[model samples]
Target chain A: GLVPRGSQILCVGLVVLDVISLVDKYPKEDSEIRCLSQRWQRGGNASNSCTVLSLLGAPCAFMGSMAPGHVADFLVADFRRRGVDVSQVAWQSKGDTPSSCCIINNSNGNRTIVLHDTSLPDVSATDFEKVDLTQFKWIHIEGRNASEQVKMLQRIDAHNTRQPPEQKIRVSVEVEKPREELFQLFGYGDVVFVSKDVAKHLGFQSAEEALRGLYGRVRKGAVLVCAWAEEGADALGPDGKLLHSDAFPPPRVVDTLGAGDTFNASVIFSLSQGRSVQEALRFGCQVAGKKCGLQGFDGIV
Target chain B: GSQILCVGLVVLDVISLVDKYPKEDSEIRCLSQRWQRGGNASNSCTVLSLLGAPCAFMGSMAPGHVADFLVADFRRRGVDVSQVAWQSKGDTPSSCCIINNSNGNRTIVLHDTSLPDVSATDFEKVDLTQFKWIHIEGRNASEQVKMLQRIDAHNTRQPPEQKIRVSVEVEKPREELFQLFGYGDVVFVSKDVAKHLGFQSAEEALRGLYGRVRKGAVLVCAWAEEGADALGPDGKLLHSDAFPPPRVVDTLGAGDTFNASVIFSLSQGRSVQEALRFGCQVAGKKCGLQGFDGIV
Candidate 1:
């Protein structure tokens, strides 16, 4: 197995609580309609990605600060129940944690999200770099680090390049949005995964195009992966530049939520252990596809 | 400090003012955006507290994000909300206020209260003997009416009594309006409300309004621009002249505040006529203000 128990992949990023409301219509002027239902879910980019990865047989260590409240406690319990070690994670003082709510109107399978989140905590190298990198073969970095991670990236580059030639450590970068020093994340990584939504924000149309566009701008690697919807994932590497894969078909999509994070975990686990981009995208899709089959972000396929 | 208890539900009122209400389903020009804490009972208690009465509002307060805005607004109004317990098991109520400003009317859609009906016993915890007045909104009529009858009974039996004076404000609903008058010491009814009950004029409704209430209580009926008409304890009809109207901003809580001030004045030993004028002025002053926070 690529990610056996006791192995480590430190996922350092955001933790969020998702509050969703279902309404009949996008309310018009003076229009009154009742919400058909309301729900609360444990979600966030990094935490979700780690859960997805863990469910794909990777041993995940989630390191993110959250409010020491019910939502935060539930999220932590979920991580542990799914076999992800959240031992290194800390809780932000309740005073500082972001308590967010989202108004989601679902018509058919489509949704328009109206979200409001309070100030989020910024993760630090001092907070996370304490983890021994050699103990973990791979590290999937969450995007919450913009400025400080750059400094950490330089330090990590120095640490990895100067290591004994026999010790090879892989780093994975998950991009959700375009940041000022985003490509630098790729510089410290062996494989890069960007979500389609993030790709579009970066001015690319599809996953393959994003990988193609980012490949030239970042350090050379075996694969540049991109996660998509049920259409699955597309990848780029040396041979002819096109790798697309899915898990045949997702069994049942309870919620197409958190599929991207699962893909990140599975993709990193697959590629770090020598699977081709073709096999990695499929495995990644399988992990994500499995998640969409259940109620929460960490559900198995 | 005198304690004033407002009886009603505070609604999450979402308003969208359009130039003209859409005739069909097609969109129209929206003129303004407004959101507020509203409900006849909620506004009256808010006004009472603003006027320096140590007021407590008792109503259905549910938990979760649904109750978020309404609870915040109550606290903001300086209302002593210790009696406002949470109905954690129930859902929050919502209301949509669509204002046709040109016609001086609004179309309201209310989210009905989902909690088990509040009982007369709910008020036993309240320090009613310390309270000068207990104002009830006609919300859960049967339950609230039963509660008011209990308070009236308490007031009747207290020795050397400083019995709680009961006042009920009628917002809507025909059957509850009549039933509430049975338990209240004072009844406030709007001209439009009289029309809703098939009354041709305010005078006709005031005559028989207090037939169900206990003796010594008064019937106070509000008429637009004509001030108010009241039946005294001696069963004589008295009318107060209308105070001049201010530049109307929103007529939202004008009546509720009128009831609060009238209760304020009457309990203060002023004549019913003086209390009516004071209530009219207070309401007129309220019309000149903005939201509940601006109304004092």
Candidate 2:
């Protein structure tokens, strides 16, 4: 429905212009070699999740900071075309849209990325205050800049304190980076997603192990979820219940560009529909497994 | 004076400035990377604008972020782009990855996309009387031939004083571009095409291609370092020595600058000999500067 929903999910994060150059093989530096194909795709963790959520018929909105330029205009058009509400986004007058120059080798799907994000400003706590907190049923944040994120999360914490448990907006925090400072984010979320790379950076080998290994950092009544490729996904409920889904490998992995994003969006979509944590884990695996065999998020739902 | 219309391509140039060229598969750092608007016909329009001439660029560009940049750049430089054919789909407007070496060397890897070029059908809509001169960059032989014939048709319909004088530059050595002969009143042939024609000297190339043009046409060959040579309608040969700068900073669009400079001189009704000398001087000035600013 185009009408506003009281339980709409708000994805707060980045959206960058992703420039991809596909080559048969890596060329020598400084040499002139034509790319096999090239594309300009809109990508970012929270941005991609919002796209998948809207496609899956989930009531969702994307909240982030955008520059006032043609690049930003293209990004806004893409989101609105996908049925994602972007009216809550913040704007800056002078800035360059962040771009990720990516080179993908067709031989093995290995990609090397160079980031150009020096000019654009990130979403701040002041931008979060402009949002009406009562309209959201869930808030998923892509973790970055611990200082600003902490302030934003604490404001949500303050709002939750003023309302009864049933009316409070549930928060989900994502810790995808290996930075130790992000460990502070573990306390504020009702549901925390610890990525495989981040878990491995903390010395946990697999998703099942991360569920038990992250015991000290999580709050007493919070759910912990970890997703691992090939190993499927695992979840630990707030009531001390543990469940794991076996690997849901597709016929073949054609592209692994947005598997993680698909998993997170599917899990959030399923759980918001009143499905159990165990059921959401299985749904996430199936959706992510299907996405790995596809290029871009078009028909994966 | 009426505006000059330049027919060509406008592309996005992604430049990587490094201390030196890098080797295979090794991680390295470039001093900087930047995106600029570039193309042969496009550069000529900018150079003409810098030379205090009102000009319009007629090219094809895909509409998107890159085209947005190209249009904005042309407007900023005071060059009208109202004649541009913008594609509703496709993002691949000719893209060139330029690698700049600190020692003043540069390499380019170009991707020529399928964004359609300006055909005779598209050129038919233009009000030819508004332009004093029409300069076409010789490319895509068949369509260019049709465009030249269309211009000839328009010239035949107008009085002598109102007829638009046409200039064509045969820069590439493609066999098909030979079809562009006999239509233009003035022609610019590149040193590359001259060498490919088996003429070692600029004078020899001018003498060889001079007979192929219309009976009252002028032919010019602007050779680097060797200067420029022009053959007049009455069989008189004129030459100008290259004006070498003490230090050369950039030579990327020097050829296009020469064509634009010559067009500027000829548009003002200068003699063929004077325009040849002026073209060499203007192109020499261009090599001493980074971009087309105050080059007059």
Candidate 3:
């Protein structure tokens, strides 16, 4: 049966113009070198995850803020071309579109990124009120600026309160950074995905410790997932016990750029399809492993 | 003095900062990247605009977004782009990669085959009398000669006080556009061009061109660090010391800066000696900055 949907997921976060350059090694200061290859693409945690979800047959829309510029125009074109809805996005008249320069190491698939400082406004709580909450069954947010995100989650919380349990909008959140404010969003996600780095930052020594430590912190009935690269991923259900999924061995590691994004998107997609938490973790590992084996996430699904 | 007009190329430049060049079949990482607008005439015009000169550009550009960006950049810098020849359907004139080394040297790989070259037809459409000085880039040699002759003829029809002075940059010696040599009120050449012309030094190149050009025309040769040498129409050889830049980011647009500064100074009735020194100082100042922005 099809998941009949106008919008099944709404990804809220940043979208930036990502300029990728292939070089032999990182250049030293006051030096110049030529690139073997170069390309421009749309990139950002939320942007990449939303793109992956859309490609995996999840009807999704992106909600973020971008300024009016040629770079923004290029980003919008890329989103539309990838079949991701941008109607929910907010636009600004002034300020340059944020951009990132990613220098990819062809030898080992390492990337050094430099992000441009932009004045483009962030999506505010007021912007969330304009969204038709009923359209989306799931909302996945890339946590940044916790105060703003808490307000957005609170609105969803109010919306959920007005509806019956069956029609409630489930929320999932990815915490890549361990900002003190970011911890506040943990209680809002029905499904929470935490990065190992964030987990370590939060004082846990291992993914299991992180999962068990986080289990008691999240809301009741919520699922917690912690991704430990190479070691595999782990999840803790509402019952407070941990289930582990070994990392699928990749045949070749061409790029590790978007593995985390692929993992989260796959987990969200699988869970939305009614897979068990353990099953979603296994599926996410397979998808993320394949993503690492490839050069980019275009064919991950 | 009236405004000046520059005629020639308009290009898009992609510059990369890197540590070292990679070996064959290998790749290297870039430290930073920048997109810039370039071209001999456009760069010269930008310098003129920055100097607060009323300058206009007469060149052909493809009707593409990159071309639009170039036009916008020129407009932002206060250069008159109204005279540009916009091709209805074609790619932008050129795209080039400039690799800057830690030592401040640069390697260029340019792609410009698809760009449309403006012809005498395009030149004739512009009113030459509006400019007190017109500098022409020696690209399409034969066409430039035709344009120069036509502009000279047009100048003859105007009142003597309203006639425009002509300057020419004959950097590509292989072009052998000697016909343009006799027409320029001032002619500029580079060290490589002088060597290609079989001259032993800038002095020889300056004198060689002095004898070949029509009487009363000044010829100058720019030798990178050695500064510049000029032979005036009065048969006087003048040498100007180069102002060493405090720091050299890139030397891409130094010559264009020199040319525009000389033309601007001379058109304002400055002495030839003063103009030569002014040109060298401006060029040196430009070398201290990256690209052509600071000089302009």
Candidate 4:
């Protein structure tokens, strides 16, 4: 058997509370301003995608440091409501929760936020209890911090031999930004997901073109999928033909808060179930549409 | 009954917690950053909400980026915003605060309030006697002052015990013009507000100053750190020694809150003495919390 089907996927990334305000225009610097309306929702790429995967009925867990405030309580309850697994989520930091703000211009859904972050508390090694990687089948790591994720991957690798070959955890990573240590992370994963923005930041033009460029550089067994929002999602295997999923039009235009992350959730979910790449892409698109079509964060389902 | 209604400009504030206050043209490193729902009237509404009061805000909010922060921040704090009249033009409200650690002092840099014309049309649905207490900041100039006068007319007709209380914090003093005084039941002013009215001292000013206005109630004058004094409803002047709290965190909305806490106490059937005592406690506690509405 190839990579065994995964029963659960764990997300290790930032979980943020997004404060959204709608306005017409940006004010002149140092001028008093007022908003039209305000609202708050869960945000951040990793958690959003996990919400999507959870919606597709795959058990998902988000691992990251959250503030020790009451808002963290809201975040945890929300994830559980969406059917995501929270058992593995270790609150490395017990201080103020992580938050992202979108200062939205209601005329257009454009927002400029001066991101706020508290020092994430230290996570001890003991926090990484050995998870049953064979439980469902796939592991998806967001680039919250590669070092910690790599350690978790190494544990799975170390524990891989003990389990039946069909029960090993197949690792995947959805990269947000480029890291010099990314090669090592890619080495641990069976597939790596990249957005069109990240691909361009890494000197490639299009995600599809970049996957072709990054294909040979990756390990022979690794797969690479690049998502181009509104265009489509593309994936490639080692020396294999490119797989493309045309962009699915959303039924309605709402807040696209968790769409991208949800796409990752669907792909990881399907791939864990040992479904074909085409099937995974289809599911990912549906999950993404489900995300942007709704309001608030965790709109994955 | 609408026990409390916050009517004015509700602006979103962007704050940076700095280690110390910066001087003119100097830069200070932000120790931490925070953005919360902020507005003078909006904050009062939030405190009322946390204190188990049903609150609603009536103000013009911008639709896009400007209003988004306020909208989000307010919804989280549980302030009702169903009546937020949207303005298609104009940017959102924002403020930056440089907070000091040693004293928890904060200095504010403000932007535009982006307020719409506070017209009779805006108040068409309003019932004057419905709100047990109304707190309006001194902005919105002629229109808000006129609106205050109308509310004063309603309070004037009510029996002594049931008249709706009004508390106005003068961001701009209009004593020389004297169009606003007939509208207030209790007015909280500061030293600078007295100075703005060309008064040399708090006592001498009260006789010549408040005498010009119809006052069946009190006029309180707050002198920062020196404490506050008021002309009692009986027209006898009573001054309080400063009840200084632990430390001053932010003075941004301290005065407004002092006024608001008084109004809130009075609304809950507290006497003037009890309301003032509770106002001091609320303001003292507000000195410990950051943002305008965060004390609760």
Chain A accuracy of model 4 expressed as TM-score:
0.86
Per-candidate DockQ versus the true complex? 0.10, 0.20, 0.12, 0.11
lDDT of 4 by residue, B109-188 (tens): 45554446456567655766556777666665567776776776776677877776676665455543345555567776
lDDT of 1 by residue, A1-301 (tens): 2444326777777776554556555555333345666665667777776776666676678777876644566576767777878777765654333333333445653353323233446767776566556556666677656677766666567777877754656677777777656555665566777777778887888777787787775576546778768666888775546888855455656766676776787777777667877787888777677677777753464
Task: Kindly report which residue pairs in candidate 2 clash with one another.
Answer: none
Give the Cα lDDT of each candidate.
0.67, 0.81, 0.80, 0.67
Ranking by DockQ: 2, 3, 4, 1
Error of 3 at B197 (Å): 16
Worst 10 residues of 3 chain A by lDDT: A26-35
User: Native-contact fraction for each model?
Assistant: 0.03, 0.11, 0.00, 0.09
Q: How far in Å is the alpha carbon of B207 misplaced in model 1? A: 14
Rank list by TM-score? 2, 3, 1, 4
On lDDT, the candidate that comes out on top is 2
Cα lDDT for residue A140, candidate 3: 94
Q: Summarize candidate 2's per-residue lDDT along A1-301 as a digit string, tens digits.
A: 3445366899998887766777777655434456777777888999999999998998888987787766688788888888888978889775666655566678876666555445667888887877787778899999876778889899998999988777888888899989988889998788888899999998989887889889567887788999988978999976777789977888888878888989999998888888989899999999999999888988798
After superposing candidate 4, which stretches have Cα over 4 Å from the reference? A1-6, A27-34, A92-94, A122-125, A130-136, A179-183, A251-253, A289-301, B1-167, B170-180, B183-186, B189-212, B215-251, B257-296
**lDDT per residue as tens, model 1, B130-156:** 577888877677667667767867866
Top candidate when judged by TM-score against the true structure: 2
Instruction: For candidate 3, list the clashing residue pairs, or say none.
Output: A23-B28, A23-B29, A24-B27, A24-B28, A24-B29, A25-B29, A32-B18, A32-B100, A33-B18
- The residue-by-residue lDDT of candidate 3 on A244-269, one tens digit each, is 99998787787787889999999999
TM-score of structure candidate 4: 0.61
